[PDB]
């Protein structure tokens, strides 16, 4: 039985019209342009990329030293400055395509998607979870810095993260649009410590109430843990803290299977599934989110 | 360590500007303005879905039967036809945002992008693979008839599906922009044997070869299976006959490991894994392509 949930990207158009190609010198990547502002990573300054100066590299350029392309026109540079790990470029022309906007900070379980690009040019959309040690599990190549994450409220974009950097065990991490990075990371090409990533209980919650809502339920039993009993389970166990939500009280509800049935059910499962299948797995799932399984499931926003 | 493979779909962009809703009577969905044609799925006619008549609903119709608004404007009906589970409805405007665009038929492993609407409004994005028994894994709701799939080369567009239903085990079908349907489904609200399912051979190939170049071999062993006899061992065991391709090709020449010593490695795996991983999963993988596994970890169209 198939259970309704897949990797779910919100539709890209409404920000393939805000990307644009930012080089300066020998490099190249993508950045965002809203109203007169265009948003790029900051190591496009750099020509050795270890241990650079950014503040030097800063004063090093000249508005003359940055050439912005839209390819989806070319962009005169009016304005530029530095803040965190991001450029911000003033552009003569406000980008007439400019969505309603804000800018946020994604916490770790939360889930966004992300448009990556190449040369300034949109090629493909993916949705992650920001992990518990500020990575993400997405797919980037060389030339992809710049590209956006970023969720949607109604009409209004709330861009969270610019691409920046690879891990050495493969994942990715970037900064927000105040300029920091996520986590402990730095934008430099030297070695980092990355901290040890958790199972997010909240969402293999949401995983286990989505094999309810498909019939799949042996793993429900009577028995519970308290949320605080299990919150001490966790920090010994590589799962996250559970901090309940609405949007979990409402699965609760429509299943009449309480929270706390579940985080019983994930102690025991932790240990083993026994050669049984959850929605087709047999590990714990938490890619998916409450809301997720809200809107994918049951219509509900 | 994180692969780099994650379900990737192309920017919906171009698409979103095709998408509109179709009203006849009590029942609204969505169609896709091309030129100065409207598809939508036929049931849109129906009142009672059970064995419909709708040769005599066609003609029952005339041009002011059918509302199609835009709302990412409202198309005046000058013309209606009806092809295979697909109406053909003409508009006295043509979308200007008309993409380069082919209609196509997208094949068993074939990955393609859909586009999920209600109300002509676009609302998410996912990938699939069709499956051997001709549905997909995806994710609808009531209202989602006429949301599209679609693959893309270069700036063409190649839509290949106009979504229609879901069967009881909870996977989807639609039809082709010929008006077929995808296997021996039809478009009435009664039972439908539904094929069984196996697993795509070239895409549990394709992942195996994603986990060599990510570092993950162990299955590697120097035995081999010949294409022939594992496609006789494929009859028996629910898997599809493999077929070869150059992209396959490509990934057995940047790795240097041959296809039949993977074809070998599937037939161990399938009995059991023996409490090892592979990239992270411990059964056999058949979501990712050949192109995929090209394109994500190198780069390669």
Redesign the interface.
């Given at each position: 039985?198939?259970?309704?949930?897949?990797?779910?990207?919100?539709?890209?158009?409404d920000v393939?019209?805000c990307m644009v190609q930012v080089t300066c010198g020998s490099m190249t990547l993508n950045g965002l342009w809203l109203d007169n502002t265009v948003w790029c990573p900051r190591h496009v300054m750099c020509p050795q990329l270890s241990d650079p100066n950014y503040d030097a590299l800063l004063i090093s350029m000249t508005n003359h030293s940055f050439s912005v392309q839209k390819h989806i026109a070319n962009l005169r540079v009016v304005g530029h400055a530095m803040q965190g790990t991001l450029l911000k470029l003033t552009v003569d022309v406000a980008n007439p395509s400019t969505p309603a906007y804000t800018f946020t900070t994604v916490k770790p379980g939360a889930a966004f998607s992300v448009?990556?690009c190449y040369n300034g040019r949109?090629?493909?959309?993916?949705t992650?979870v920001m992990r518990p040690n500020y990575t993400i599990?997405?797919?980037?190549?060389?030339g992809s810095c710049g590209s956006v994450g970023y969720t949607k409220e109604g009409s209004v974009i709330n861009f969270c993260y610019m691409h920046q950097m690879e891990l050495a065990?493969?994942?990715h991490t970037g900064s927000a649009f105040d300029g920091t990075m996520y986590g402990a990371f730095m934008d430099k090409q030297v070695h980092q410590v990355q901290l040890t990533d958790k199972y997010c209980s909240v969402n293999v919650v949401a995983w286990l109430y989505a094999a309810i809502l498909?019939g799949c339920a042996w793993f429900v039993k009577p028995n519970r843990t308290s949320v605080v009993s299990f919150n001490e389970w966790a920090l010994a166990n590589q799962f996250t803290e559970f901090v309940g939500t609405q949007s979990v009280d409402m699965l609760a509800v429509k299943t009449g299977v309480a929270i706390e049935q579940l985080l019983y059910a994930i102690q025991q499962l932790y240990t083993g599934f026994q050669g049984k299948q959850i929605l087709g797995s047999?590990?714990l799932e938490d890619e998916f989110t409450p809301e997720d399984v809200n809107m994918?499931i049951m219509?509900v926003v």
């Amino acid at each position: 039985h198939h259970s309704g949930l897949v990797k779910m990207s919100h539709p890209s158009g409404d920000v393939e019209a805000c990307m644009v190609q930012v080089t300066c010198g020998s490099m190249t990547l993508n950045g965002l342009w809203l109203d007169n502002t265009v948003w790029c990573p900051r190591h496009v300054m750099c020509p050795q990329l270890s241990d650079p100066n950014y503040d030097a590299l800063l004063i090093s350029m000249t508005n003359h030293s940055f050439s912005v392309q839209k390819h989806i026109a070319n962009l005169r540079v009016v304005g530029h400055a530095m803040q965190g790990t991001l450029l911000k470029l003033t552009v003569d022309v406000a980008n007439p395509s400019t969505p309603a906007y804000t800018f946020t900070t994604v916490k770790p379980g939360a889930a966004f998607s992300v448009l990556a690009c190449y040369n300034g040019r949109p090629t493909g959309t993916f949705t992650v979870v920001m992990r518990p040690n500020y990575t993400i599990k997405g797919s980037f190549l060389c030339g992809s810095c710049g590209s956006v994450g970023y969720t949607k409220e109604g009409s209004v974009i709330n861009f969270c993260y610019m691409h920046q950097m690879e891990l050495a065990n493969g994942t990715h991490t970037g900064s927000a649009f105040d300029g920091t990075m996520y986590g402990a990371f730095m934008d430099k090409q030297v070695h980092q410590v990355q901290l040890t990533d958790k199972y997010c209980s909240v969402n293999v919650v949401a995983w286990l109430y989505a094999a309810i809502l498909n019939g799949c339920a042996w793993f429900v039993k009577p028995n519970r843990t308290s949320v605080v009993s299990f919150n001490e389970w966790a920090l010994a166990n590589q799962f996250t803290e559970f901090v309940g939500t609405q949007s979990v009280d409402m699965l609760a509800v429509k299943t009449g299977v309480a929270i706390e049935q579940l985080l019983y059910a994930i102690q025991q499962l932790y240990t083993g599934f026994q050669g049984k299948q959850i929605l087709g797995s047999t590990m714990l799932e938490d890619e998916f989110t409450p809301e997720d399984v809200n809107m994918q499931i049951m219509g509900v926003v």
